[PDB]
Design a protein around this ligand. Structure first.
Ligand SMILES: Nc1ncnc2c1ncn2[C@@H]1O[C@H](COP(=O)(O)OP(=O)(O)NP(=O)(O)O)[C@@H](O)[C@H]1O
Ligand SMILES: Nc1ncnc2c1ncn2[C@@H]1O[C@H](COP(=O)(O)OP(=O)(O)NP(=O)(O)O)[C@@H](O)[C@H]1O
Ligand SMILES: O=C(O)[C@@H](Cl)Cc1ccccc1
Ligand SMILES: O=C(O)[C@@H](Cl)Cc1ccccc1
Ligand SMILES: [K+]
Ligand SMILES: [K+]
Ligand SMILES: [Mg+2]
Ligand SMILES: [Mg+2]
Lengths: 307, 307
């Protein structure tokens, strides 16, 4: 399970579990989308009038209409068509973070309660993650993948998923700078346990891109020889901790109280850190920074295990 | 300068700076000791009645009496005798932390506001540190040491002072376990800057003893081969950061919210962490912990530079 939301682990050769899951989504999705729409309705007028914000507001209204127009699921044929709707919505909404980032960029500067936008984005993006997790889990229940129950991996290796995003981040970095730091991984490198990959897929590349950028920009004279990024995995009975340590110079004292703000960037829209922290906390984890100004930064991602 | 307190850097071949410093102490010390006595008077009755607490309470009353009985300093002869008094008090009060630790151990368990004892100890021990710093600075103004203005070092090497306490902590550890982790020091190893050693002399051995203990107790099967403790020095224009990282297994989740409490220990009286944090914060710095349960702990000491 996740916040106020359960990921069904059920199984059935008759397929009765798919119907129960689908009926659950049918009950749950319209209510959560309605909460998002209320979020839009309460946005400060001048922000809500932004055409890009209006577009996203309308997307959610359409989603609500489609979800509520769909008849109650009674058989596999109904459930099958519901999945088509769910797939369409997942796709129609895939650029929502980007659209909100852009819609909010300028319009936020008007109102003076800066807490409002942070609150709306935390609430909106985490609810969205939860919705996409539930929806994707349902679809995945149809899949035949070993080591997976829906989107839940029954034996996830933290080292493997980290290496996947390391390779991705390294490619982006090389394309921009001509090279990328090597990454070393230490600690509980052989750990395997049940876990939902999706949050890691969102968070890890954000933290890795940050570490690599900082490392390259502080070693412009020696791009062919930069300090490794060092990742430590700690696996205990309560949580999984992933520490990502770089020698990229640290986060400056003058920037320290701003790096967690949406739209703050020293370079994207400056979303990597605030979104990653909102997601971690939404799931009962946390994201903490330790800056060693002049040396580097340690970032600690903590995510709870599955009970 | 330090909190509401200035360490005089003055100089004079006539020695007029010693008189000005001494008169400053004469003004300042009785007032601060009076505040400590008020602290004792406000302690919960049942704690204040403890014979060891009463003994310390009386020590401070005697100090106040001696300080206020001393006539106004007018010449070098007066100043010279005042230093004798200051030396006597520094010596008479050298075991105060220990006496308070013991006096408070049981008696604190009676009252239910646990915040009270923490507050009294933070306030009492930091004020005491400040007093001992001011007093020792004054005495040291008579000394002829190169690279020192009183207790202020004009070119302190963080690496050197760390190595001094490493050797000390390693000896204690070897005596208890038969071996000690090696310590590596990296980062700004060649840094030198004006700094007051005294807080580092209090804090560093406390953090090093913790790291070494944890390392030895988690490697009982291989005491002859344990993970190094790794210390990173970061020196910037705002602060000095010293990170002490061990592979001693971490601080358990169940203990995490208690390790900063006076008297909490899994083994002294459990004072190393709460005192070290109070001292750091008293000076405008901080002490932060990052636990990787199952792996180790990172401890970050931050102390502000001298303006
Ligand atoms: N490991 C790091 N070292 C140094 N600076 C960092 C580090 N991580 C983040 N920062 C700084 O923190 C700022 C904000 O980070 P972030 O929220 O991820 O947005 P961004 O990287 O600038 N753009 P985005 O692609 O949206 O994530 C960065 O722009 C940097 O100035
Ligand atoms: N680096 C560490 N790794 C694991 N546990 C630690 C570490 N540092 C502190 N602790 C734990 O934190 C507790 C409290 O620390 P502390 O305040 O320094 O008191 P103490 O070491 O037990 N006794 P004292 O000699 O008075 O300092 C310890 O007893 C340990 O259980
Ligand atoms: O904004 C999104 O990505 C989500 Cl909330 C769109 C969606 C709604 C309902 C079901 C699946 C996806
Ligand atoms: O408790 C202490 O160590 C200090 Cl406050 C005693 C003292 C008082 C005054 C001057 C010097 C030392
Ligand atoms: K940001
Ligand atoms: K303690
Ligand atoms: Mg980023
Ligand atoms: Mg200790």
């Amino acid at each position: 399970l996740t916040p106020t939301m359960m990921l069904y682990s059920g199984r059935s050769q008759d397929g009765s579990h798919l119907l129960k899951s689908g009926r659950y989504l049918q009950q749950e999705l319209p209510v959560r989308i309605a909460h998002r729409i209320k979020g839009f309705r309460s946005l400060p007028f001048i922000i809500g009038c932004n055409p890009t914000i209006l577009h996203v507001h309308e997307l959610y209204i359409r989603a609500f209409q489609k979800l509520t127009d769909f008849p109650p699921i009674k058989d596999q044929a109904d459930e099958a068509q519901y999945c088509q709707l769910v797939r369409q919505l997942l796709d129609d909404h895939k650029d929502v973070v980007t659209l909100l980032a852009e819609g909010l960029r300028e319009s936020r500067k008007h109102i003076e309660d800066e807490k409002l936008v942070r609150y709306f984005l935390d609430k909106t993006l985490t609810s969205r993650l939860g919705i996409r997790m539930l929806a994707t889990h349902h679809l995945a229940l149809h899949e035949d993948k070993p080591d997976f129950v829906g989107i839940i991996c029954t034996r996830l290796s933290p080292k493997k998923i980290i290496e996947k995003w390391v390779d991705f981040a390294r490619r982006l970095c090389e394309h921009k700078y001509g090279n990328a730091p090597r990454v070393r991984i230490n600690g509980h490198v052989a750990a395997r346990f049940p876990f939902i990959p999706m949050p890691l897929d969102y968070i890890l590349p954000e933290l890795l891109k940050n570490a690599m950028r900082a490392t390259m920009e502080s070693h412009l004279d020696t791009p062919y020889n930069v300090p490794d990024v060092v990742i430590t995995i700690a696996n205990n009975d309560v949580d999984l901790i992933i520490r990502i340590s770089d020698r990229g110079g640290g986060i400056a004292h003058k920037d320290l109280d701003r790096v967690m703000d949406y739209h703050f960037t020293t370079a994207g829209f400056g979303f990597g850190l605030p979104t990653s922290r909102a997601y971690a906390e939404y799931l009962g984890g946390s994201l903490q920074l330790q800056s060693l100004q002049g040396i580097g930064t340690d970032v600690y991602l903590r995510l709870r295990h599955i009970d």
